[PDB]
Amino acid sequence: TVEEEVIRFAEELAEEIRRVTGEAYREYAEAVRHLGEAAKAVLEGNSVEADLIVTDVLRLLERIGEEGLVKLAREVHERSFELLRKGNRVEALALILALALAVALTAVSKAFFLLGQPARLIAEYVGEKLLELRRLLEKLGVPLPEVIALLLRVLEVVEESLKAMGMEPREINRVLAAAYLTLAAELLERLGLTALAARIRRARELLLAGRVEEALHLLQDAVELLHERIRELGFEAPEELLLADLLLQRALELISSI
């Protein structure tokens, strides 16, 4: 039904915030439910109530005090207003869902860092949530490059929040690299390159266990073989290969900077 998937995504995201944290972070759950209501409103035709709800969420996040989240909220407000005036329902829905996921991941990461959890669980949870959002957006109809751009925007927001809170840079780089690696592994696996995806997952697992250099070399070998495949295909290479290559290069940079 696709729409029911969006409403269930919003409700399940709010319930996941409640399960992970409880009532210590309730403004985030309120904002996520508001964004779900806005996404529901978009799907029937009402385009002004969506703008009003997005402005309400912007006020809530401004009261919360997360600079990157507020910036993303302003950008979503402007782009969603313009697209809804023009008639691009799908991209406005994608922006609303990306904002909701960004708020949820910010709350979850803040709770995990305050508790004192290691970077492994944060990395797996962020990767799983990004995978769920990617599947939802692909079911909706958003083109893949825009989906990847939205996911990178969400990851940028999460990284900014973690850096501002006080986390040491190495752990932030580790979790961002793990998220990029799982995204790239999913992208490669979708195209049928199961062994390459398995190698990427092995590299991610070795990275999360403290074995940095071994994961670095595994990733470099995977990158070289991906380049061989891409340049053998020619100019008919599906966008999955190029997006996975870019994500792997970002992961290489982040892992090297560790």
Where on the chain is the footprint of a copy of itself (CB under 8 A)? 21-26, 30, 33-34, 37, 41, 48-49, 51-53, 55-56, 59, 78, 81, 85, 111-112, 114-118, 120-121, 149, 152, 195-196, 211, 213-214, 217-218, 221, 224-225, 227-228, 230-231, 235, 242, 245-246, 249-250, 253
* Distance of alpha carbon 206 from alpha carbon 177, whole angstroms: 12
Q: For residues 131 and 242, which CB has a smaller minimum distance to Zn ion in the complex? A: 242
Q: For residues 139 and 194, which CB has a smaller minimum distance to a copy of itself in the complex? A: 194
Shortest distance in whole angstroms from residue 96 CB to Zn ion: 13
Shortest distance in whole angstroms from residue 165 CB to a copy of itself: 14
Asked whether the beta carbons of 123 and 179 are under 8 A apart, the reply is yes
| Residue carrying the six token digits 């959002």 | 133
Mapping DSSP onto H, E and C, the string for 169-197 reads HHHHHHHHHHHHHHHHHHHHHHCCCHHHH
Structure tokens at 64: 């919360």
Shortest distance in whole angstroms from residue 139 CB to a copy of itself: 25
Identity at 110, one-letter amino acid code? K
Shortest distance in whole angstroms from residue 249 CB to a copy of itself: 5
**Binding at 165: pick from a copy of itself, Zn ion, none (beta carbon under 5-8 Å per type):** none
Where on the chain is the footprint of Zn ion (CB under 5 A)? 51, 55-56, 221, 245
Shortest distance in whole angstroms from residue 79 CB to Zn ion: 11
**Binding at 71: pick from a copy of itself, Zn ion, none (beta carbon under 5-8 Å per type):** none
Asked whether the beta carbons of 167 and 78 are under 8 A apart, the reply is no
Shortest distance in whole angstroms from residue 56 CB to a copy of itself: 5
Q: For residues 20 and 242, which CB has a smaller minimum distance to Zn ion in the complex? A: 242
* Distance of alpha carbon 185 from alpha carbon 59, whole angstroms: 37
* Distance of alpha carbon 171 from alpha carbon 120, whole angstroms: 9
Q: Please give the DSSP secondary-structure letter assigned to residue 33.
A: H
Q: For residues 8 and 139, which CB has a smaller minimum distance to a copy of itself in the complex? A: 8
* Distance of alpha carbon 258 from alpha carbon 43, whole angstroms: 44
Q: For residues 121 and 220, which CB has a smaller minimum distance to Zn ion in the complex? A: 220
Cα-based distances in Å from 185 to 140, 190, 204: 21, 9, 10
Select from 222, 176, 173, 164 the least CA-distant residue to 197. 222
* Distance of alpha carbon 42 from alpha carbon 172, whole angstroms: 35
Give residue number: closest CB to Zn ion.
51
**Binding at 196: pick from Zn ion, a copy of itself, none (beta carbon under 5-8 Å per type):** a copy of itself
Q: For residues 21 and 106, which CB has a smaller minimum distance to a copy of itself in the complex? A: 21
